[PDB]
Design a binder for this molecule. Structure first.
Ligand code: V2M
Ligand code: V2M
Lengths: 298, 299
């Protein structure tokens, strides 16, 4: 099951940011509003913007911030700065419902929750994994820029994504909160090509373990491939590096099946499924992490 | 096409923990009323054959402890208690100051809704399920999840449709509507129960094929057509639900130009075999996406 964190924490932080005739979502934490910087850019310049000239041309009053959740309010902007592909706006009132938070960058294969927003109003939530080519496969429509992606550890939200674009293949990307765009895509209105996607090997392993736990173990055999041998094969068949984790070990102890058997099985199941099914799938499944398998199948 | 849930913040502000004896589970706080599954009155020795009428009469308002954890912690004093089908309807003296606009409508097979999974009154995760024709759902419910709540949102109104009660040996799940009746008439006792046979949700297979077409996957479309009446008599023989068209479906017909009866014909052929070919990454029919899903996500 694709399970998301409860989103109420993050809903209380979503705002609408308007600049000239551009409008998108922003994140209100304490005295700061984060939002994508292209809100500054008029339409006649989206294809080829000069963000530094645009930033100089803005004043605090160029920016309009509104809260539509709970007690609606207008937030007075009293400072503006740019950080990579984000604007960092300072407002005069602190968000009284600010969670404990950090900013982290997610590595490919890691899962996180997304709150999709339109005009500062939360509309849906879903879970994604960062692909090896630094894209995600969510559902983002018009007005979804500034929607936020995050994980939770205890009561602390770790913010990891702010939405910026949709590639022509329907896939999506955005920034970490240091301003850097995932996959180095540029925040301008141009057709851009992503690198070839790969399978997240550790996720495929975790999924096969989940199959065995539910009683589906047909692919299991005594044939082993070593970690180092599998990884050499992976470079030629568009798989990531396998890296072991204690999470994967838990799933090998409980299952009594070695990673090396599953690594061999991956090579053979990639060749083809020979007609059968694994957990309702006829293709490899790489969007469930070892942590998901550990928490869901007990 | 992706599994998508409503934002859960509205519902999180309504969850409470309900304790009775050595028993504890989740509750839903709306106005002055807390709903929860009635088996919280039963001790675990007796769950196999609970005497719910006798349990209710032996309970006093002090037999129930309702605790709110999300936000500012408080104990909610019980000043009334009643039973309605498989649910308890407790009256507390403090009205929930964050009660959303809501309705209580039972969902039909093939409809999708969002679940807030909770443990001892604390929300832990959210996901979407669809009600199967055998009145089960397939989410992720662990120990302590009874009282977790299922819902849909239209505009500002929350429609509460599901209160979690049980896990079948199949790994599948069921619970109550908020009128107190159990989906599929499963009984709320610690006994083995076998669900009825599943079916494919016909109207959702149609929606998914429309989604295939919109995304450039249309090899399965032929000129050939099966009427709704002819398809439905076939559905009875082949474990499909009766196809009932809606405006939501017709919208997809118009955007694509592929009529409903073309997809009904295609389904009959696809159910016999995809012949190695794929539709949206699948070698099998998919019925977990509704027409509304396809409209919102692809248009
Ligand atoms: C945000 O709403 C914008 O603030 C918007 C979200 C997408 C609109 C449709 N679905 C979405 O997810 N983002 C964009 O419009 C961005 C803006 C950039 C970062 C300045 N641009 C694109 O997503 C974009 C541009 C182009 C393109 O050009 C030419 C050609 C093809 C695809 C494409 N996507
Ligand atoms: C609630 O958390 C309980 O308050 C719990 C939820 C399930 C636990 C695992 N996943 C869930 O959805 N509910 C139960 O444990 C209920 C309680 C009964 C009605 C008193 N029981 C079952 O779901 C149950 C009992 C049995 C069983 O017996 C023997 C045999 C097989 C399956 C089964 N399920």
């Amino acid at each position: 099951v694709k399970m998301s964190h409860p989103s109420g924490d993050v809903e209380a932080c979503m705002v609408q940011v308007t600049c000239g005739s551009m409008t998108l979502n922003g994140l209100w934490l304490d005295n700061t509003v984060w939002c994508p910087r292209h809100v500054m850019c008029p339409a006649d310049q989206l294809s080829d913007p000069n963000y530094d000239a645009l930033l100089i041309s803005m004043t605090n009053h160029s920016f309009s911030v509104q809260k539509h959740i709970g007690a609606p309010a207008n937030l007075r902007v009293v400072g503006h700065a740019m950080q990579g592909t984000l604007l960092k706006l300072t407002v005069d009132v602190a968000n009284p419902s600010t969670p404990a938070y950090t900013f982290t960058t997610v590595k490919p294969g890691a899962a996180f929750s997304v709150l999709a927003c339109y005009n500062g109003r939360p509309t849906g939530t879903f879970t994604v994994v960062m692909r090896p080519n630094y894209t995600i496969k969510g559902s983002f429509l018009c007005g979804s820029c500034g929607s936020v992606g995050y994980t939770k550890e205890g009561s602390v939200i770790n913010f990891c994504y702010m939405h910026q674009m949709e590639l022509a293949n329907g896939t999506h990307t955005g920034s970490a909160f240091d301003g850097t765009m995932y996959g180095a895509f540029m925040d301008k209105q141009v057709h851009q090509v992503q690198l070839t996607d790969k399978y997240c090997s550790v996720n495929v392993v975790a999924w096969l373990y989940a199959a065995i736990l539910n009683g589906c173990a047909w692919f299991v055999k005594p044939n082993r491939t070593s970690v180092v041998s599998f990884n050499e094969w992976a470079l030629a068949n568009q798989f990531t590096e396998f890296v072991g984790t204690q999470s994967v070990d838990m799933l090998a102890v409980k299952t009594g099946v070695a990673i090396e058997q599953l690594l061999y099985a991956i090579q053979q199941l990639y060749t083809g499924f020979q007609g059968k099914q694994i957990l309702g799938s006829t293709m490899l499944e790489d969007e469930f992490t070892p942590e998901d398998v550990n928490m869901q199948i007990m």
